Design a protein around this ligand. Structure first.
Ligand code: PNK
Length: 263
């Protein structure tokens, strides 16, 4: 069946010229709303949540892991390193790297998280351990953002990512302390005001992780606390036909608005 909300999302997609994927979980009743929910999309930076969460999982059995120093060398710098560049020829702890990857989307920090997990396959292995059979990380930064249409590398589906984000932030995929840390990091994100958040009533609070890549790929995944009701988990993925397409965070805001108005 096609719902009123799905019809509005289809209209939005049509006017956007691209391909939109949406997955909402309303924890008030566990109901879901999906649009292209089982189609694959390039994750880009939204994959940083899985990497940080995997390191948080490791920290459950190593109390000092998050304080472990990691060397940052000039050769480690990639295409976007707002935090790591300050620490070249020095070190950053795994907590510092996690916070930089999540809150500033630092790509060198993400690479250190991936390395700590034994490579992209280590991130995928953690996804499998928490019941996500869909997620796949295949490359490091910056190539994991090529976002080529039809390419399965570094992709997931909106349904899978929403389920995983719910388990990580509201469920028991991580220990209580680690879940709280992840939520704190997401709520402190600096990059999300133009995306899902721009489509929500101002009174609502949220934590999110954005992503962008080639093909005008523009993504956001969020955990939301609406005024007067149980939290929501929302994933909005968007990708376009031309490699050099411009970002469209406004499309994510529009999708979020349709979802909020549809509650
Ligand atoms: C500036 C950021 C905050 S960081 C960046 C990052 N993507 C890239 O570096 C690849 C790329 C390749 C070609 C064009 C754009 C991006 C990611 O997905 O985390 N995403 C932005 C965001 O989330 O708003």
């Amino acid at each position: 069946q096609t719902s009123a909300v799905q019809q509005k999302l289809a209209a939005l997609e049509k006017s956007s010229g691209g391909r939109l994927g949406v997955a909402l979980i309303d924890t008030a009743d566990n109901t879901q709303v999906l649009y292209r929910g089982d189609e694959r999309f390039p994750m880009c930076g939204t994959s940083k949540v899985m990497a940080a969460a995997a390191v948080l999982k490791q920290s459950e059995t190593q109390k000092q892991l998050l304080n472990q120093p990691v060397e940052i060398k000039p050769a480690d710098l990639v295409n976007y390193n707002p935090i790591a560049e300050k620490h070249v020829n020095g070190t950053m702890t795994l907590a510092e790297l996690s916070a930089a990857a999540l809150q500033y989307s630092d790509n060198t920090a993400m690479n250190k998280l991936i390395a700590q997990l034994g490579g992209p396959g280590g991130v995928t292995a953690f996804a499998r351990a928490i019941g996500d059979e869909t997620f796949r990380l295949d490359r490091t930064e910056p190539t994991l953002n090529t976002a080529i249409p039809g390419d399965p590398r570094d992709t997931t589906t909106p349904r899978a990512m929403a389920q995983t984000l719910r388990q990580l932030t509201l469920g028991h995929a991580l220990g209580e302390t680690q879940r709280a840390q992840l939520v704190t990091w997401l709520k402190g994100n600096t990059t999300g005001a133009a995306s899902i958040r721009a489509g929500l009533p101002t009174s609502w609070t949220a934590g999110d992780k954005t992503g962008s890549g080639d093909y005008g790929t523009t993504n956001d995944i969020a955990v939301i606390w609406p005024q007067g009701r149980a939290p929501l988990v929302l994933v909005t993925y968007f990708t376009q036909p031309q490699q050099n397409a411009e970002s469209r965070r406004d499309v994510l805001a529009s999708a979020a608005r349709i979802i909020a108005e549809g509650l």
